[PDB]
Design a protein around this ligand. Structure first.
Ligand SMILES: [Ca+2]
Ligand SMILES: [Ca+2]
Ligand SMILES: [Ca+2]
Ligand SMILES: [Ca+2]
Lengths: 410, 410
């Protein structure tokens, strides 16, 4: 194997599929919506399937109708004209956008700052570019008294400063956050932005859950803050926007001098994305761009729908004494498990607590979830190994089955 | 920009799409079928769109249904049990497969051997992995007096051997060849295998056109030669197989100890490919796998439809004193332009003759083609710059429109 990939071959994630394969199991593990996608999204793929051109090669950097849709949508959000050709790159999901960003912008021996826990691909991507990941953890503050929330988790601004050096190339920001559900505050984004302009670094901003923020919170884009447009790449995703995870289309939005470099990676890796999916997606975006101020709009109706399910899941978790962190955004909820019965001495292995716990819960209680330490650099794992992540973008019937289990739990 | 991407940002192929901005111009340039895809390819994409699961994430290394079909198809071809999980990897086109191969197996300072002319992504992919491309040209033999064919182009076994050394990691082989149409002989393939075995090098075999061989020629896979299975990655395409170029799905077939590395690259770049495309494709495969001896099988019916279109193009090219090289395979035809009225004063300074001629033919005859020099390293262009490539995977309307131009040439 080539050197750039030494030690990047870990997949405990096929293990988590194996656990979940048994069909008498309620799988609340991986982020697999089992709700229907919007009808019109399915319809549009079908319509595009029957047009010959829509089955042939389209523009390398994104299908013109799609990048037209995206520029119009984000134009509104940024309050800025966004250039469909120079300031957007369409790629194989947000995943591939992250790849373009890091491969195009990051050099061997560069430092990249990562907030732990992190969407897990951030570490191997930075190492493959020959760069050094520099970890800083989220820490929790005291609670309001009533409930534990995502907002009770923050970073230490002075600790963050301590991470930046002349070697810092970039920082990777993920908001709304996976796995916490944290919606970063304008004050938190201002601390980060301060350090990027101060240190002349870039910010890679992973905002795939931009539409899933709940009551009392607002998605704020760091790229919109003073001095940040020049230096930010902001990444979105079709899968997350339209509950169509199997489409694997995402976008990078930022200034032309940075998008250039992303574009070169794309050109030299896979060249172009699929035409029918992009065609269809552009129609779907149009359907929703035109009704943004209605509850009918998918950007509004989905978080309204999901918030109910969030609250249902909180209660269910509480009903067995798992201690839930109610999320500000996204469609994951994390739950501390330590105050349940520590049952695992006899499961013999130096695997972190939560892998063990999840394995136990799958065997005995017929429910799977994800161990939060799967989202942690090796030195950070002990500080998170009592934490377990559940996904709730599920239909009622699935949550019912989950309810069946928690009722019967004792 | 990251050092890895330095001077790999040229796409002279954007000037070519600019020449395609038709003031009523018959576009015979890029490999863009304008025949309809098989009706059932389209049908299956639509059916898939309506299944909720088919719109959500699938196995990262390739949709189960798809890897199974590939396994059964290619097992019939290789004469072996091919493991659908460990010996196949599904990627974003064959383009993505090549990228998987180079990033997975090639290190800085490795030498990779390429044959000129070459599909043009080969050079920058090699360079982006920090390796050094080593070029060997194809050369003409004396013709049989009667006609010029792809089989009049060959390599010199002694010249090829001289390009092998201990720095050589791999050789990229492309058969049937693009742009030339050459279906490599068993005798030719034997020379490559000998050198790969003697030198313990890899072979990356790009075989996207493997179904497009015309009468009096057979696709043979180097991977099937004695000693080659354990050292070859062989690449296929959804786009080329089912005339569906915009679907961007391709696969690498080969030994576990090589595929595991390609799997790593994919896992840290794009992760999973589109579910509905892959679901649909699997079903298309099953349809044709079950009818392989029938003239209805797309594998048989397509080369048959195309041979007629090739022959038609040979006449038309001849009809105006463009000397065509008849291809054994694929859907491109190269023609020698040199002995036309070959005077082009309008464009000064020596960027290549074929670029000037393609620009001339656009403006004056409303026909585009691709200049062969664009598939050559800088030292090789002079030897190939009187050659021009035309695409004939075109509906009768389009070739009728072609006839009218050749008719009105003189
Ligand atoms: Ca190793
Ligand atoms: Ca502008
Ligand atoms: Ca700096
Ligand atoms: Ca050797």
């Amino acid at each position: 194997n080539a050197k750039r990939i030494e030690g990047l071959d870990s997949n405990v994630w096929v293990e988590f599929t194996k656990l979940a394969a048994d069909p008498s199991v309620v799988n609340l593990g991986q982020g697999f919506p089992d709700i229907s996608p919007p009808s019109y999204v399915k319809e549009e793929l079908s319509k595009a399937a029957f047009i010959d051109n829509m089955n042939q090669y389209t523009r390398g950097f994104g299908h013109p109708a799609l990048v037209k849709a995206l520029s119009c949508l984000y134009g509104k959000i940024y309050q800025r004209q966004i250039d469909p050709n120079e300031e957007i790159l369409v790629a194989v999901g947000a995943y591939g956008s992250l790849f373009n960003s890091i491969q195009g912008l990051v050099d061997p021996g560069d430092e990249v700052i990562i907030m732990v826990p992190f969407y897990d691909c951030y570490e191997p991507m930075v190492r493959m570019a020959g760069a050094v990941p520099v970890f800083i953890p989220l820490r929790s503050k005291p609670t309001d008294g009533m409930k534990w929330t995502s907002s009770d988790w923050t970073f230490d601004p002075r600790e963050l400063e301590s991470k930046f050096s002349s070697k810092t190339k970039a920082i990777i920001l993920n908001t709304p956050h996976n796995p916490l559900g944290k919606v970063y505050t304008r004050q938190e984004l201002q601390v980060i932005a301060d350090l990027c302009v101060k240190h002349d670094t870039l910010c890679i901003s992973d905002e795939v859950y931009e539409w899933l923020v709940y009551t009392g919170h607002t998605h704020v884009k760091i790229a919109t803050l003073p001095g940040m447009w020049e230096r930010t790449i902001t990444i979105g995703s079709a899968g997350k926007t339209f509950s169509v995870t199997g489409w694997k289309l995402g976008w990078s939005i930022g200034p032309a001098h940075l998008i250039k470099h992303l574009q070169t990676v794309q050109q030299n890796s896979f060249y172009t994305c699929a035409t029918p999916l992009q065609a269809a997606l552009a129609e779907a975006f149009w359907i929703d761009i035109k009704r943004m101020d209605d509850p009918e709009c998918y950007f509004n109706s989905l978080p309204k729908e999901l918030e109910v399910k969030r609250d249902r899941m909180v209660r269910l978790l509480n009903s067995v004494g798992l201690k839930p962190i109610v999320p500000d955004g996204g469609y994951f909820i994390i739950a501390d498990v330590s105050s349940l019965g520590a049952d695992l001495s006899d499961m013999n292995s130096d695997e972190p607590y939560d892998y063990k716990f999840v394995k136990w819960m799958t065997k005995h209680k017929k429910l799977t979830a994800i161990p939060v330490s799967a989202f942690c650099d090796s030195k950070s794992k002990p500080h998170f190994e009592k934490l377990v992540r559940f996904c709730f973008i599920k239909k009622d019937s699935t949550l019912d089955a989950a309810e069946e289990i928690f009722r019967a739990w004792n």
